[PDB]
Structures are given as C-alpha cells and as structure tokens.
Amino acid sequence: DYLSSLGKTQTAVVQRDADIGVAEAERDAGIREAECKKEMLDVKFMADTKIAD
Amino acid sequence: IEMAKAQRDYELKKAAYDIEVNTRRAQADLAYQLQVAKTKQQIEEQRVQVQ
C-alpha cells in the first residue's frame, strides 16, 4: 500500500477544511438562535408580568 | 444571563402581587366569622333576656 499511504496526506486536508467550515456555521447558527430565544423570552415575560398585574 | 434577568423580573413581581392577594383573601375569609360573632352577641343578649 504505497499509493494508498501517499493519498493519506491530503485525504484529510479537505476533511480538515470541511470540519472547520461546519464548526463555524454551527457556531453562527447557535449564537444568533440564542439571541432570538433571549429576546422572545424577555418579551414573553414582560407580557406575563402585565397579565399577573 | 438575560434569561435569569427576565426570570427575576417576572417572579419578584408575581410574588409581590401574591402577598397582597393573600392578605386580602385572608381578611375576606374571616370577615364572615367576625360578623357572625358580632351578631351572635345580640342573639345571646336576647336569648338570656327571655330568662
């Protein structure tokens, strides 16, 4: 397995880039989704406070 | 963090309002007993006048 070993050098480089990209995308999705959840909870709790009053 | 901010802002006011509603409900429950005793005063005042 000469050639198969030789392919190992870059068979993971593209996997490296793909993992980096998917990690960045998931990070952005998570951050902005958390922001949305925060805003909607704040408004919902304000409405519930008025209901309680 | 802001989740807990909102949780405090809601829970503290809910408890503060609950204090007032519980006090008023406690007064309302025993108003009946207070009045029934106050009128049982006269009930007994006459139930002994017959004697």
Side-chain angles (χ1 to χ4, degrees):
Chain A
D1 61 350
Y2 204 51
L3 302 178
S4 86
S5 72
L6 192 44
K8 299 288 95 175
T9 75
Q10 188 157 349
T11 188
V13 176
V14 298
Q15 263 154 0
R16 169 250 290 175
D17 179 40
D19 285 2
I20 298 297
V22 69
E24 202 285 310
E26 294 294 328
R27 174 260 291 191
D28 217 321
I31 190 167
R32 188 268 183 276
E33 183 178 1
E35 273 284 352
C36 299
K37 182 64 70 177
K38 175 276 292 183
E39 297 151 300
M40 174 265 312
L41 267 297
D42 311 331
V43 176
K44 186 180 289 293
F45 277 129
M46 181 36 48
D48 293 12
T49 293
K50 307 305 299 311
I51 297 306
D53 196 307
Chain B
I1 301 299
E2 311 325 325
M3 292 294 178
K5 204 53 52 163
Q7 199 73 33
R8 194 181 71 51
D9 291 331
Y10 161 64
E11 269 306 309
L12 188 153
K13 313 311 300 313
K14 182 174 72 68
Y17 305 171
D18 291 331
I19 295 171
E20 292 255 10
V21 65
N22 294 127
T23 49
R24 303 320 319 299
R25 184 260 300 299
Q27 184 178 2
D29 291 331
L30 305 188
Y32 181 79
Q33 293 179 356
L34 181 63
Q35 186 52 43
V36 73
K38 290 201 270 203
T39 186
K40 185 73 51 63
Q41 290 182 357
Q42 293 154 330
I43 301 299
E44 280 289 339
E45 161 74 17
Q46 309 293 342
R47 279 183 76 212
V48 182
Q49 188 41 243
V50 65
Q51 262 55 50

